[PDB]
Amino acid sequence: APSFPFSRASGPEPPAEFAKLRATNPVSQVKLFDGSLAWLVTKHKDVCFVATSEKLSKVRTRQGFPELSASGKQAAKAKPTFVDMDPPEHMHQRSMVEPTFTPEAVKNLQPYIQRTVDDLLEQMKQKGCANGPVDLVKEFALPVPSYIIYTLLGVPFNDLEYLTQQNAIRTNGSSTAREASAANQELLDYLAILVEQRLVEPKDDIISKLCTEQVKPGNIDKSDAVQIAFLLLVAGNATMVNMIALGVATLAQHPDQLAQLKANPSLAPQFVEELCRYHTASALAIKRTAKEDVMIGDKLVRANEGIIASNQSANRDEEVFENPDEFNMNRKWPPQDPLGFGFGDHRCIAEHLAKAELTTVFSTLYQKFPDLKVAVPLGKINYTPLNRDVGIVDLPVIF
Ligand code: HEM
């Protein structure tokens, strides 16, 4: 039973194990860091089954849950938020915050998303690159999602830059454990004060809605409101940053795709679709324990055994996506959904928001900067460590 998680084959590539498994061993056991086992599911049909089966649970206090690291195991001890809940608790809590994220709400947010992107691009332009390249991550990929989610939560504008930096320290590979933990607690302490403030004087933000609609009637406590807000901040932000950077790198890697997007920015939605399939930057979230025996393919998953369903592997499944290892913005899409945002009731609350942020980026960036170029050879890009989800740490650019 091989150790899991697997390391990526190279900076921008999935782990090499998954194609082999899809071909010869699609449902198989892997060994986790603590010596426990889990079933690894690799085919799109089977990932969808795992994501939707009511015989499977996300509750992390169930013995058999596939925690992938020592830190994951300690994190499982806390009071869960909706990410780790089953029905009916899951939607009881998730419904408290899903209004901001609906397709229609995100459509109505489009002008705000556009203005945020425009403003950050203009700051980049005013800074310029006369003295050499600038880091597209720090200057752009980081602040776009950060400013948006903090603003939606209720953070005032003058606090965005500092809080963006502190949330990045949580996940920066260069942070020490103390630095990351202190940043985590700093943000929680900040959000607690915002909850206190919005309970006394609500404003038109997510924290205020939690306060008025859930804390004041006694449906949740203040501490719960803080933890729900924190989940919305930390769940997806670093993933968004990585997706922006990976999109820029991918366009540089495939010049004719960039040429097409520059000639027709209305292709941004389809570029984003392909990006979210090809670069599955959150690949380790579709995890379960079996509450009772369940058959998956030619395997029996027994009660209290763990399951990891790779959406990354599903998104490269040749039975669903023809020529899956080719990046093609002009892909002819099958009926089956790509799984970049997961599947089933737990499917990313922010899928529509994330796609709108990415579409806005990729329909704007090369209109602003038609001569944007990565300022190092592409083979020297600084990707996330290979034992992590795919991403980019920094990306020197000129324009
Ligand atoms: C391109 C960026 C993003 C990607 C690829 C992504 C991907 C995912 C994936 C794969 C899951 C797991 C879904 C499942 O369990 O099947 C998920 C869950 C979730 N995401 Fe995202 N996400 C992104 C951005 C965001 C943003 C911007 C936010 C917040 C504003 C967010 C908040 C969440 C939350 C709270 C959950 C848990 C949903 C639940 O379990 O009910 N995500 N996301």
Side-chain angles (χ1 to χ4, degrees), residues 5-15 18 68-69 71-72 170-173 238-239 242 246 280-284 312 383-393:
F6 301 142
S7 283
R8 300 205 306 285
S10 69
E13 292 182 292
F18 294 138
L68 301 183
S69 69
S71 59
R170 287 176 53 259
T171 54
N172 291 159
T239 300
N242 281 321
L246 288 163
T280 301
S282 180
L284 303 171
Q312 174 175 231
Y383 293 96
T384 57
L386 299 183
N387 77 170
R388 301 293 289 153
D389 278 315
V390 67
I392 290 173
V393 176

PDB file of all heavy atoms in Angstrom, residues 5-15 18 68-69 71-72 170-173 238-239 242 246 280-284 312 383-393:
ATOM      1  N   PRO A   5      -0.527  11.377   0.945  1.00  0.00           N
ATOM      2  CA  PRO A   5      -0.561  11.870  -0.427  1.00  0.00           C
ATOM      3  C   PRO A   5       0.693  11.557  -1.251  1.00  0.00           C
ATOM      4  O   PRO A   5       1.801  11.365  -0.786  1.00  0.00           O
ATOM      5  CB  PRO A   5      -0.717  13.382  -0.302  1.00  0.00           C
ATOM      6  CG  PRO A   5      -1.039  13.656   1.081  1.00  0.00           C
ATOM      7  CD  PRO A   5      -0.677  12.471   1.933  1.00  0.00           C
ATOM      8  N   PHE A   6       0.474  11.472  -2.578  1.00  0.00           N
ATOM      9  CA  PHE A   6       1.468  11.308  -3.608  1.00  0.00           C
ATOM     10  C   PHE A   6       2.088  12.677  -3.940  1.00  0.00           C
ATOM     11  O   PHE A   6       1.441  13.682  -3.738  1.00  0.00           O
ATOM     12  CB  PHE A   6       0.902  10.719  -4.863  1.00  0.00           C
ATOM     13  CG  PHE A   6       0.239   9.363  -4.740  1.00  0.00           C
ATOM     14  CD1 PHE A   6      -0.906   9.090  -5.470  1.00  0.00           C
ATOM     15  CD2 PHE A   6       0.740   8.373  -3.912  1.00  0.00           C
ATOM     16  CE1 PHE A   6      -1.551   7.865  -5.402  1.00  0.00           C
ATOM     17  CE2 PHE A   6       0.111   7.133  -3.814  1.00  0.00           C
ATOM     18  CZ  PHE A   6      -1.006   6.889  -4.569  1.00  0.00           C
ATOM     19  N   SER A   7       3.307  12.670  -4.442  1.00  0.00           N
ATOM     20  CA  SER A   7       3.949  13.897  -4.831  1.00  0.00           C
ATOM     21  C   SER A   7       3.647  14.138  -6.325  1.00  0.00           C
ATOM     22  O   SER A   7       3.575  13.197  -7.139  1.00  0.00           O
ATOM     23  CB  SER A   7       5.445  13.893  -4.538  1.00  0.00           C
ATOM     24  OG  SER A   7       5.733  14.106  -3.148  1.00  0.00           O
ATOM     25  N   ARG A   8       3.495  15.367  -6.712  1.00  0.00           N
ATOM     26  CA  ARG A   8       3.278  15.725  -8.107  1.00  0.00           C
ATOM     27  C   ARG A   8       4.473  15.263  -8.919  1.00  0.00           C
ATOM     28  O   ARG A   8       5.612  15.256  -8.467  1.00  0.00           O
ATOM     29  CB  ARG A   8       3.142  17.256  -8.263  1.00  0.00           C
ATOM     30  CG  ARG A   8       1.941  17.769  -7.417  1.00  0.00           C
ATOM     31  CD  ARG A   8       1.388  19.089  -7.974  1.00  0.00           C
ATOM     32  NE  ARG A   8       2.382  20.134  -8.131  1.00  0.00           N
ATOM     33  CZ  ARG A   8       2.936  20.871  -7.155  1.00  0.00           C
ATOM     34  NH1 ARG A   8       2.644  20.664  -5.864  1.00  0.00           N
ATOM     35  NH2 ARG A   8       3.805  21.816  -7.470  1.00  0.00           N
ATOM     36  N   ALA A   9       4.238  14.891 -10.188  1.00  0.00           N
ATOM     37  CA  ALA A   9       5.324  14.397 -11.054  1.00  0.00           C
ATOM     38  C   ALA A   9       6.361  15.470 -11.360  1.00  0.00           C
ATOM     39  O   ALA A   9       7.535  15.114 -11.561  1.00  0.00           O
ATOM     40  CB  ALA A   9       4.789  13.831 -12.343  1.00  0.00           C
ATOM     41  N   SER A  10       5.923  16.717 -11.420  1.00  0.00           N
ATOM     42  CA  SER A  10       6.749  17.900 -11.606  1.00  0.00           C
ATOM     43  C   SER A  10       5.914  19.085 -11.178  1.00  0.00           C
ATOM     44  O   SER A  10       4.723  18.913 -10.889  1.00  0.00           O
ATOM     45  CB  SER A  10       7.229  18.030 -13.029  1.00  0.00           C
ATOM     46  OG  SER A  10       6.212  18.317 -13.913  1.00  0.00           O
ATOM     47  N   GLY A  11       6.499  20.280 -11.168  1.00  0.00           N
ATOM     48  CA  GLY A  11       5.824  21.488 -10.749  1.00  0.00           C
ATOM     49  C   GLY A  11       4.356  21.597 -11.141  1.00  0.00           C
ATOM     50  O   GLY A  11       3.496  21.749 -10.281  1.00  0.00           O
ATOM     51  N   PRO A  12       4.077  21.571 -12.447  1.00  0.00           N
ATOM     52  CA  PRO A  12       2.678  21.787 -12.932  1.00  0.00           C
ATOM     53  C   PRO A  12       1.899  20.520 -13.141  1.00  0.00           C
ATOM     54  O   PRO A  12       0.759  20.637 -13.661  1.00  0.00           O
ATOM     55  CB  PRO A  12       2.879  22.516 -14.259  1.00  0.00           C
ATOM     56  CG  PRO A  12       4.164  21.892 -14.774  1.00  0.00           C
ATOM     57  CD  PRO A  12       5.055  21.639 -13.573  1.00  0.00           C
ATOM     58  N   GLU A  13       2.432  19.331 -12.844  1.00  0.00           N
ATOM     59  CA  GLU A  13       1.764  18.080 -13.212  1.00  0.00           C
ATOM     60  C   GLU A  13       1.088  17.406 -12.017  1.00  0.00           C
ATOM     61  O   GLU A  13       1.564  17.551 -10.858  1.00  0.00           O
ATOM     62  CB  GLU A  13       2.800  17.107 -13.821  1.00  0.00           C
ATOM     63  CG  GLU A  13       3.329  17.541 -15.159  1.00  0.00           C
ATOM     64  CD  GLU A  13       4.296  16.491 -15.661  1.00  0.00           C
ATOM     65  OE1 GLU A  13       5.370  16.341 -15.058  1.00  0.00           O
ATOM     66  OE2 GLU A  13       3.979  15.821 -16.637  1.00  0.00           O
ATOM     67  N   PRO A  14       0.043  16.617 -12.262  1.00  0.00           N
ATOM     68  CA  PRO A  14      -0.516  15.743 -11.225  1.00  0.00           C
ATOM     69  C   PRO A  14       0.532  14.666 -10.816  1.00  0.00           C
ATOM     70  O   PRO A  14       1.502  14.369 -11.498  1.00  0.00           O
ATOM     71  CB  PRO A  14      -1.725  15.070 -11.870  1.00  0.00           C
ATOM     72  CG  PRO A  14      -1.985  15.793 -13.097  1.00  0.00           C
ATOM     73  CD  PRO A  14      -0.717  16.456 -13.527  1.00  0.00           C
ATOM     74  N   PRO A  15       0.290  14.024  -9.691  1.00  0.00           N
ATOM     75  CA  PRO A  15       1.023  12.801  -9.354  1.00  0.00           C
ATOM     76  C   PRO A  15       0.903  11.811 -10.512  1.00  0.00           C
ATOM     77  O   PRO A  15      -0.195  11.590 -11.053  1.00  0.00           O
ATOM     78  CB  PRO A  15       0.331  12.280  -8.099  1.00  0.00           C
ATOM     79  CG  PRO A  15      -0.238  13.530  -7.452  1.00  0.00           C
ATOM     80  CD  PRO A  15      -0.714  14.364  -8.639  1.00  0.00           C
ATOM     81  N   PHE A  18      -1.817   8.417 -10.548  1.00  0.00           N
ATOM     82  CA  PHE A  18      -3.256   8.355 -10.805  1.00  0.00           C
ATOM     83  C   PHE A  18      -3.594   7.751 -12.166  1.00  0.00           C
ATOM     84  O   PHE A  18      -4.542   6.949 -12.282  1.00  0.00           O
ATOM     85  CB  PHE A  18      -3.943   9.719 -10.672  1.00  0.00           C
ATOM     86  CG  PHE A  18      -3.943  10.307  -9.278  1.00  0.00           C
ATOM     87  CD1 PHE A  18      -3.688  11.664  -9.137  1.00  0.00           C
ATOM     88  CD2 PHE A  18      -4.257   9.590  -8.161  1.00  0.00           C
ATOM     89  CE1 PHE A  18      -3.758  12.174  -7.882  1.00  0.00           C
ATOM     90  CE2 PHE A  18      -4.289  10.173  -6.896  1.00  0.00           C
ATOM     91  CZ  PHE A  18      -4.038  11.508  -6.744  1.00  0.00           C
ATOM     92  N   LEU A  68      -4.681  13.236   6.748  1.00  0.00           N
ATOM     93  CA  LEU A  68      -3.501  13.058   5.921  1.00  0.00           C
ATOM     94  C   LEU A  68      -2.232  13.564   6.552  1.00  0.00           C
ATOM     95  O   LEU A  68      -1.143  13.337   6.007  1.00  0.00           O
ATOM     96  CB  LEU A  68      -3.720  13.753   4.600  1.00  0.00           C
ATOM     97  CG  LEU A  68      -4.915  13.273   3.775  1.00  0.00           C
ATOM     98  CD1 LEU A  68      -4.986  13.990   2.457  1.00  0.00           C
ATOM     99  CD2 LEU A  68      -4.842  11.759   3.525  1.00  0.00           C
ATOM    100  N   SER A  69      -2.317  14.258   7.676  1.00  0.00           N
ATOM    101  CA  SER A  69      -1.169  14.812   8.341  1.00  0.00           C
ATOM    102  C   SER A  69      -1.427  14.878   9.841  1.00  0.00           C
ATOM    103  O   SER A  69      -2.579  14.849  10.272  1.00  0.00           O
ATOM    104  CB  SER A  69      -0.833  16.198   7.749  1.00  0.00           C
ATOM    105  OG  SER A  69      -1.787  17.123   8.079  1.00  0.00           O
ATOM    106  N   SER A  71      -1.093  17.533  11.606  1.00  0.00           N
ATOM    107  CA  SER A  71      -1.888  18.763  11.902  1.00  0.00           C
ATOM    108  C   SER A  71      -3.365  18.544  11.649  1.00  0.00           C
ATOM    109  O   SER A  71      -4.213  19.110  12.335  1.00  0.00           O
ATOM    110  CB  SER A  71      -1.419  19.976  11.111  1.00  0.00           C
ATOM    111  OG  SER A  71      -1.540  19.637   9.746  1.00  0.00           O
ATOM    112  N   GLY A  72      -3.796  17.733  10.726  1.00  0.00           N
ATOM    113  CA  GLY A  72      -5.143  17.435  10.362  1.00  0.00           C
ATOM    114  C   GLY A  72      -5.791  16.699  11.517  1.00  0.00           C
ATOM    115  O   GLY A  72      -6.947  16.966  11.921  1.00  0.00           O
ATOM    116  N   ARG A 170      -0.408  32.558   7.075  1.00  0.00           N
ATOM    117  CA  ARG A 170      -0.934  31.259   7.505  1.00  0.00           C
ATOM    118  C   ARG A 170      -0.464  30.109   6.618  1.00  0.00           C
ATOM    119  O   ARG A 170      -0.253  29.017   7.157  1.00  0.00           O
ATOM    120  CB  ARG A 170      -2.451  31.224   7.459  1.00  0.00           C
ATOM    121  CG  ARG A 170      -3.175  31.983   8.486  1.00  0.00           C
ATOM    122  CD  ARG A 170      -4.689  32.001   8.347  1.00  0.00           C
ATOM    123  NE  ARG A 170      -5.100  30.608   8.261  1.00  0.00           N
ATOM    124  CZ  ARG A 170      -5.423  29.984   7.113  1.00  0.00           C
ATOM    125  NH1 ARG A 170      -5.441  30.567   5.918  1.00  0.00           N
ATOM    126  NH2 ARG A 170      -5.708  28.721   7.219  1.00  0.00           N
ATOM    127  N   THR A 171      -0.417  30.373   5.316  1.00  0.00           N
ATOM    128  CA  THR A 171      -0.155  29.270   4.386  1.00  0.00           C
ATOM    129  C   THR A 171       1.169  29.408   3.674  1.00  0.00           C
ATOM    130  O   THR A 171       1.545  28.472   2.941  1.00  0.00           O
ATOM    131  CB  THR A 171      -1.306  29.137   3.374  1.00  0.00           C
ATOM    132  OG1 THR A 171      -1.522  30.404   2.735  1.00  0.00           O
ATOM    133  CG2 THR A 171      -2.598  28.733   4.016  1.00  0.00           C
ATOM    134  N   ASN A 172       1.916  30.501   3.827  1.00  0.00           N
ATOM    135  CA  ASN A 172       3.200  30.637   3.131  1.00  0.00           C
ATOM    136  C   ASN A 172       4.124  29.530   3.531  1.00  0.00           C
ATOM    137  O   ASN A 172       4.325  29.260   4.714  1.00  0.00           O
ATOM    138  CB  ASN A 172       3.797  32.004   3.441  1.00  0.00           C
ATOM    139  CG  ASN A 172       3.220  33.307   2.930  1.00  0.00           C
ATOM    140  OD1 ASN A 172       3.414  34.487   3.427  1.00  0.00           O
ATOM    141  ND2 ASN A 172       2.432  33.185   1.832  1.00  0.00           N
ATOM    142  N   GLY A 173       4.754  28.905   2.555  1.00  0.00           N
ATOM    143  CA  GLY A 173       5.703  27.833   2.847  1.00  0.00           C
ATOM    144  C   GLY A 173       6.840  28.280   3.667  1.00  0.00           C
ATOM    145  O   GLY A 173       7.463  27.511   4.401  1.00  0.00           O
ATOM    146  N   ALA A 238      -6.240  30.799  -0.614  1.00  0.00           N
ATOM    147  CA  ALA A 238      -4.955  30.412  -1.146  1.00  0.00           C
ATOM    148  C   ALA A 238      -5.158  29.632  -2.464  1.00  0.00           C
ATOM    149  O   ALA A 238      -4.296  29.700  -3.339  1.00  0.00           O
ATOM    150  CB  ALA A 238      -4.198  29.563  -0.133  1.00  0.00           C
ATOM    151  N   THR A 239      -6.243  28.884  -2.569  1.00  0.00           N
ATOM    152  CA  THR A 239      -6.551  28.174  -3.791  1.00  0.00           C
ATOM    153  C   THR A 239      -6.824  29.155  -4.960  1.00  0.00           C
ATOM    154  O   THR A 239      -6.294  28.944  -6.083  1.00  0.00           O
ATOM    155  CB  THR A 239      -7.714  27.224  -3.582  1.00  0.00           C
ATOM    156  OG1 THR A 239      -7.334  26.275  -2.537  1.00  0.00           O
ATOM    157  CG2 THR A 239      -8.038  26.380  -4.785  1.00  0.00           C
ATOM    158  N   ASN A 242      -3.513  30.612  -6.160  1.00  0.00           N
ATOM    159  CA  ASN A 242      -2.836  29.622  -6.992  1.00  0.00           C
ATOM    160  C   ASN A 242      -3.480  29.480  -8.357  1.00  0.00           C
ATOM    161  O   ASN A 242      -2.764  29.310  -9.363  1.00  0.00           O
ATOM    162  CB  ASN A 242      -2.781  28.280  -6.272  1.00  0.00           C
ATOM    163  CG  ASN A 242      -1.697  28.229  -5.233  1.00  0.00           C
ATOM    164  OD1 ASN A 242      -0.587  28.781  -5.481  1.00  0.00           O
ATOM    165  ND2 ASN A 242      -1.913  27.542  -4.153  1.00  0.00           N
ATOM    166  N   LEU A 246      -1.480  30.035 -11.733  1.00  0.00           N
ATOM    167  CA  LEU A 246      -1.426  28.902 -12.669  1.00  0.00           C
ATOM    168  C   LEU A 246      -2.033  29.255 -14.016  1.00  0.00           C
ATOM    169  O   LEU A 246      -1.534  28.773 -15.045  1.00  0.00           O
ATOM    170  CB  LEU A 246      -2.096  27.656 -12.075  1.00  0.00           C
ATOM    171  CG  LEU A 246      -1.306  26.992 -10.958  1.00  0.00           C
ATOM    172  CD1 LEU A 246      -2.241  26.061 -10.171  1.00  0.00           C
ATOM    173  CD2 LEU A 246      -0.112  26.207 -11.473  1.00  0.00           C
ATOM    174  N   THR A 280      -6.256  21.132 -10.894  1.00  0.00           N
ATOM    175  CA  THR A 280      -7.168  20.891  -9.750  1.00  0.00           C
ATOM    176  C   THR A 280      -6.424  21.220  -8.473  1.00  0.00           C
ATOM    177  O   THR A 280      -5.838  20.333  -7.826  1.00  0.00           O
ATOM    178  CB  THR A 280      -7.655  19.433  -9.808  1.00  0.00           C
ATOM    179  OG1 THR A 280      -8.302  19.215 -11.019  1.00  0.00           O
ATOM    180  CG2 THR A 280      -8.638  19.142  -8.689  1.00  0.00           C
ATOM    181  N   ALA A 281      -6.384  22.509  -8.124  1.00  0.00           N
ATOM    182  CA  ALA A 281      -5.629  23.059  -7.031  1.00  0.00           C
ATOM    183  C   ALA A 281      -6.167  22.700  -5.653  1.00  0.00           C
ATOM    184  O   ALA A 281      -5.444  22.915  -4.673  1.00  0.00           O
ATOM    185  CB  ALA A 281      -5.451  24.553  -7.177  1.00  0.00           C
ATOM    186  N   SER A 282      -7.373  22.138  -5.541  1.00  0.00           N
ATOM    187  CA  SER A 282      -7.828  21.553  -4.270  1.00  0.00           C
ATOM    188  C   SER A 282      -8.216  20.119  -4.554  1.00  0.00           C
ATOM    189  O   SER A 282      -9.347  19.859  -5.018  1.00  0.00           O
ATOM    190  CB  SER A 282      -8.961  22.325  -3.654  1.00  0.00           C
ATOM    191  OG  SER A 282      -9.258  21.608  -2.419  1.00  0.00           O
ATOM    192  N   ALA A 283      -7.300  19.177  -4.270  1.00  0.00           N
ATOM    193  CA  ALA A 283      -7.456  17.777  -4.666  1.00  0.00           C
ATOM    194  C   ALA A 283      -7.683  16.829  -3.513  1.00  0.00           C
ATOM    195  O   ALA A 283      -7.816  15.600  -3.779  1.00  0.00           O
ATOM    196  CB  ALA A 283      -6.245  17.343  -5.523  1.00  0.00           C
ATOM    197  N   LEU A 284      -7.674  17.305  -2.279  1.00  0.00           N
ATOM    198  CA  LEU A 284      -7.624  16.421  -1.099  1.00  0.00           C
ATOM    199  C   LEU A 284      -8.810  16.611  -0.198  1.00  0.00           C
ATOM    200  O   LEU A 284      -8.794  16.195   0.962  1.00  0.00           O
ATOM    201  CB  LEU A 284      -6.334  16.651  -0.307  1.00  0.00           C
ATOM    202  CG  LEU A 284      -5.054  16.468  -1.091  1.00  0.00           C
ATOM    203  CD1 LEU A 284      -3.843  16.927  -0.272  1.00  0.00           C
ATOM    204  CD2 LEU A 284      -4.921  15.015  -1.481  1.00  0.00           C
ATOM    205  N   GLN A 312      -8.853  15.477  -8.715  1.00  0.00           N
ATOM    206  CA  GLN A 312      -7.774  15.735  -9.664  1.00  0.00           C
ATOM    207  C   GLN A 312      -7.681  14.607 -10.676  1.00  0.00           C
ATOM    208  O   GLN A 312      -7.594  14.826 -11.895  1.00  0.00           O
ATOM    209  CB  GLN A 312      -6.463  15.941  -8.901  1.00  0.00           C
ATOM    210  CG  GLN A 312      -5.228  16.066  -9.771  1.00  0.00           C
ATOM    211  CD  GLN A 312      -4.001  16.398  -8.943  1.00  0.00           C
ATOM    212  OE1 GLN A 312      -3.264  17.373  -9.269  1.00  0.00           O
ATOM    213  NE2 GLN A 312      -3.706  15.659  -7.870  1.00  0.00           N
ATOM    214  N   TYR A 383       7.081  26.675  -8.150  1.00  0.00           N
ATOM    215  CA  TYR A 383       5.806  26.010  -7.781  1.00  0.00           C
ATOM    216  C   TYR A 383       5.819  25.674  -6.291  1.00  0.00           C
ATOM    217  O   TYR A 383       6.851  25.663  -5.626  1.00  0.00           O
ATOM    218  CB  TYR A 383       5.638  24.727  -8.595  1.00  0.00           C
ATOM    219  CG  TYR A 383       5.440  24.968 -10.083  1.00  0.00           C
ATOM    220  CD1 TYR A 383       6.516  24.915 -10.969  1.00  0.00           C
ATOM    221  CD2 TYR A 383       4.159  25.177 -10.598  1.00  0.00           C
ATOM    222  CE1 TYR A 383       6.333  25.116 -12.300  1.00  0.00           C
ATOM    223  CE2 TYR A 383       3.978  25.389 -11.953  1.00  0.00           C
ATOM    224  CZ  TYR A 383       5.075  25.337 -12.808  1.00  0.00           C
ATOM    225  OH  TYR A 383       4.812  25.557 -14.123  1.00  0.00           O
ATOM    226  N   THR A 384       4.598  25.394  -5.771  1.00  0.00           N
ATOM    227  CA  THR A 384       4.498  24.826  -4.439  1.00  0.00           C
ATOM    228  C   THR A 384       5.274  23.541  -4.338  1.00  0.00           C
ATOM    229  O   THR A 384       5.500  22.857  -5.352  1.00  0.00           O
ATOM    230  CB  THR A 384       3.027  24.585  -4.064  1.00  0.00           C
ATOM    231  OG1 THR A 384       2.504  23.732  -5.088  1.00  0.00           O
ATOM    232  CG2 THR A 384       2.229  25.855  -3.927  1.00  0.00           C
ATOM    233  N   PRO A 385       5.675  23.152  -3.132  1.00  0.00           N
ATOM    234  CA  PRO A 385       6.392  21.880  -2.952  1.00  0.00           C
ATOM    235  C   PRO A 385       5.586  20.752  -3.547  1.00  0.00           C
ATOM    236  O   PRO A 385       4.319  20.729  -3.498  1.00  0.00           O
ATOM    237  CB  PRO A 385       6.519  21.769  -1.425  1.00  0.00           C
ATOM    238  CG  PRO A 385       6.533  23.200  -0.966  1.00  0.00           C
ATOM    239  CD  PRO A 385       5.545  23.882  -1.853  1.00  0.00           C
ATOM    240  N   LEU A 386       6.263  19.784  -4.096  1.00  0.00           N
ATOM    241  CA  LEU A 386       5.609  18.709  -4.831  1.00  0.00           C
ATOM    242  C   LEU A 386       4.713  17.803  -3.979  1.00  0.00           C
ATOM    243  O   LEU A 386       3.785  17.171  -4.549  1.00  0.00           O
ATOM    244  CB  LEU A 386       6.645  17.835  -5.559  1.00  0.00           C
ATOM    245  CG  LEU A 386       7.487  18.591  -6.584  1.00  0.00           C
ATOM    246  CD1 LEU A 386       8.410  17.580  -7.264  1.00  0.00           C
ATOM    247  CD2 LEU A 386       6.683  19.292  -7.664  1.00  0.00           C
ATOM    248  N   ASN A 387       4.917  17.785  -2.652  1.00  0.00           N
ATOM    249  CA  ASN A 387       4.032  17.013  -1.794  1.00  0.00           C
ATOM    250  C   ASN A 387       2.770  17.776  -1.390  1.00  0.00           C
ATOM    251  O   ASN A 387       2.016  17.290  -0.517  1.00  0.00           O
ATOM    252  CB  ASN A 387       4.839  16.537  -0.577  1.00  0.00           C
ATOM    253  CG  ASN A 387       5.157  17.463   0.540  1.00  0.00           C
ATOM    254  OD1 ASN A 387       5.634  17.032   1.595  1.00  0.00           O
ATOM    255  ND2 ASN A 387       4.941  18.729   0.380  1.00  0.00           N
ATOM    256  N   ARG A 388       2.493  18.901  -1.967  1.00  0.00           N
ATOM    257  CA  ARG A 388       1.334  19.742  -1.703  1.00  0.00           C
ATOM    258  C   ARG A 388       0.420  19.799  -2.945  1.00  0.00           C
ATOM    259  O   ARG A 388       0.823  19.413  -4.071  1.00  0.00           O
ATOM    260  CB  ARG A 388       1.746  21.178  -1.301  1.00  0.00           C
ATOM    261  CG  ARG A 388       2.614  21.271  -0.055  1.00  0.00           C
ATOM    262  CD  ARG A 388       1.777  20.851   1.151  1.00  0.00           C
ATOM    263  NE  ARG A 388       0.781  21.856   1.459  1.00  0.00           N
ATOM    264  CZ  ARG A 388      -0.399  21.983   2.009  1.00  0.00           C
ATOM    265  NH1 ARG A 388      -1.111  20.972   2.530  1.00  0.00           N
ATOM    266  NH2 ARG A 388      -0.945  23.200   2.065  1.00  0.00           N
ATOM    267  N   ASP A 389      -0.763  20.361  -2.809  1.00  0.00           N
ATOM    268  CA  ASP A 389      -1.595  20.738  -3.919  1.00  0.00           C
ATOM    269  C   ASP A 389      -0.811  21.667  -4.870  1.00  0.00           C
ATOM    270  O   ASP A 389       0.024  22.480  -4.465  1.00  0.00           O
ATOM    271  CB  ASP A 389      -2.866  21.450  -3.454  1.00  0.00           C
ATOM    272  CG  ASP A 389      -4.034  20.603  -2.980  1.00  0.00           C
ATOM    273  OD1 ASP A 389      -4.371  19.600  -3.664  1.00  0.00           O
ATOM    274  OD2 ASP A 389      -4.711  20.893  -1.950  1.00  0.00           O
ATOM    275  N   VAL A 390      -1.147  21.571  -6.158  1.00  0.00           N
ATOM    276  CA  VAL A 390      -0.501  22.380  -7.187  1.00  0.00           C
ATOM    277  C   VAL A 390      -0.764  23.868  -6.959  1.00  0.00           C
ATOM    278  O   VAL A 390      -1.850  24.289  -6.565  1.00  0.00           O
ATOM    279  CB  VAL A 390      -0.934  21.891  -8.607  1.00  0.00           C
ATOM    280  CG1 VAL A 390      -2.423  22.137  -8.896  1.00  0.00           C
ATOM    281  CG2 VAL A 390      -0.065  22.521  -9.707  1.00  0.00           C
ATOM    282  N   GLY A 391       0.263  24.656  -7.235  1.00  0.00           N
ATOM    283  CA  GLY A 391       0.224  26.087  -7.050  1.00  0.00           C
ATOM    284  C   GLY A 391       1.538  26.703  -7.415  1.00  0.00           C
ATOM    285  O   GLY A 391       2.488  26.019  -7.764  1.00  0.00           O
ATOM    286  N   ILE A 392       1.599  28.038  -7.299  1.00  0.00           N
ATOM    287  CA  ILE A 392       2.783  28.853  -7.619  1.00  0.00           C
ATOM    288  C   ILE A 392       3.032  29.806  -6.441  1.00  0.00           C
ATOM    289  O   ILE A 392       2.100  30.479  -6.022  1.00  0.00           O
ATOM    290  CB  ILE A 392       2.635  29.563  -8.973  1.00  0.00           C
ATOM    291  CG1 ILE A 392       2.699  28.540 -10.089  1.00  0.00           C
ATOM    292  CG2 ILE A 392       3.685  30.645  -9.135  1.00  0.00           C
ATOM    293  CD1 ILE A 392       2.398  29.117 -11.487  1.00  0.00           C
ATOM    294  N   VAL A 393       4.271  29.828  -5.962  1.00  0.00           N
ATOM    295  CA  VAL A 393       4.626  30.681  -4.804  1.00  0.00           C
ATOM    296  C   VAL A 393       4.825  32.133  -5.205  1.00  0.00           C
ATOM    297  O   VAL A 393       4.322  33.025  -4.534  1.00  0.00           O
ATOM    298  CB  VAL A 393       5.887  30.123  -4.133  1.00  0.00           C
ATOM    299  CG1 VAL A 393       6.345  31.021  -3.006  1.00  0.00           C
ATOM    300  CG2 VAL A 393       5.604  28.698  -3.612  1.00  0.00           C
TER     301      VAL A 393
END
